[PDB]
Amino acid sequence: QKILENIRGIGTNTMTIFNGNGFGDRRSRHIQNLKISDANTLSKQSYIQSVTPNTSSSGILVVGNKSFTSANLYGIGEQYFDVEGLKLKQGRLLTEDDVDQSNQVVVLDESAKKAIFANENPLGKTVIFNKRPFRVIGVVSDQSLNLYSPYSTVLNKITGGSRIGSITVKISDDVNSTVAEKSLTELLKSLHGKKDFFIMNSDTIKQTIENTTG
Numbered sequence: 001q002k003i004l005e006n007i008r009g010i011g012t013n014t015m016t017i018f019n020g021n022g023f024g025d026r027r028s029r030h031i032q033n034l035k036i037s038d039a040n041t042l043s044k045q046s047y048i049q050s051v052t053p054n055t056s057s058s059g060i061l062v063v064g065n066k067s068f069t070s071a072n073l074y075g076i077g078e079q080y081f082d083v084e085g086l087k088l089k090q091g092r093l094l095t096e097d098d099v100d101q102s103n104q105v106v107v108l109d110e111s112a113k114k115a116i117f118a119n120e121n122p123l124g125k126t127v128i129f130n131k132r133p134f135r136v137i138g139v140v141s142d143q144s145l146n147l148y149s150p151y152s153t154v155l156n157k158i159t160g161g162s163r164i165g166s167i168t169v170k171i172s173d174d175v176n177s178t179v180a181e182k183s184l185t186e187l188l189k190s191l192h193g194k195k196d197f198f199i200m201n202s203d204t205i206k207q208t209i210e211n212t213t214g
Contacts, residue, residue, distance in 0.1 A: 003206050011201035014083055015181060016168045017188065022198050032163040033196050036151070038188065039077075039167050045187070047180050050170040052077035053151040057158055061145065062128040063116045071145040073106075073129050075154020075164075081107070081140055083170055091123045091138030094150055098137075102152040106134040109146035113139045132157055177203065 020028030036053055043051040054076050061071035074080075081093050089110065098105055106127060113122050122136045127147070134149060155162060171180045181199055189195050 003209060007202050007205055011203075011205060013171045013173065013177070014168055015171065015184065015199050015201040016166050017184070017197050017199050018166045019197055021196075028196070031196070032161075032165065033192055034164045034167055036155070036162040036164065038191055039164070041187070041191065042167065042169055042184070045183070047172045047175045047183065048169050049172050050077075050079040050083065052080045052083055052168045053164045054080070054166045054168065055151060055154055055159060055164040057130070057154070059130040061116070061147070063125070066116070068116065068145060071112075071129065071147060073147045073149060073154060073158065075149055075151040075158065077151055079170065080148065080168075083168055084143070086140035086142070089139045089141055091136070093138055093140070094148070099150040099152050102150060102156045104132065104134045104153055104157065105137045105149065107138045107140055107148040108136055109148075110139065110142045112142075112145050112147060115145060130158070177201070 017034065018029065019032055019034055023029075039051045039053045042048055054074060056072055056074040058070050058072050061068045078094050078096055078099055081088065093107060094105070097103070108116070108122055116122070116127065117125070122139060125136050126133050127136060128134070129147070134147070140148070151164065155164075169184065171177060181201065181203065185195075185199065188197055
């Protein structure tokens with residue numbers, strides 16, 4: 001019943017593509033070869049329902065007179081909250097317009113809201129990440145100071161470049177997960193010119209459990 005009754009809902013119709021060769025290789029994970037253009041091409045495959053780019057940075061967040069360290073700002077796609085199962089609790093989520101206009105808006109984690117705002121109303125208030133002001137537009141349920149902003153805003157204004165840490169894809173409901181992984185792998189290899197990424201999904205978890213000593 002281990003694999004059974006468990007992988008339920010984790011990486012079933014979603015796959016996350018990461019830089020490098022695996023978690024058993026932190027080194028290769030630092031090299032960023034995934035690009036927004038990769039994500040654009042993926043968004044166009046017929047077997048792909050949505051694509052969410054993901055980059056992040058950990059820095060100093062000022063709120064009013066308070067200063068916090070190791071606040072994580074994620075630059076993610078519009079579909080991020082849905083695919084990760086984060087429930088909107090208050091205000092609003094990112095829109096296509098936020099992404100398109102690279103708006104400095106942020107969506108707070110439940111525990112981030114509590115840590116930074118306690119019982120205060122967070123909506124409409126400004127938080128400053130590494131000197132850059134963002135307006136709080138909403139709050140979601142959590143997965144340690146997580147803030148979510150459009151990937152475009154974070155790339156354009158914070159990290160620079162068009163390279164990212166990972167891409168989560170939502171697979172078409174009516175396609176064979178194994179076939180989708182293969183097409184996705186072949187396309188990205190073609191794009192990058194080499195296999196310098198790895199894919200995490202239900203199959204990966206299962207394959208890990210099978211190959212561990214019990």
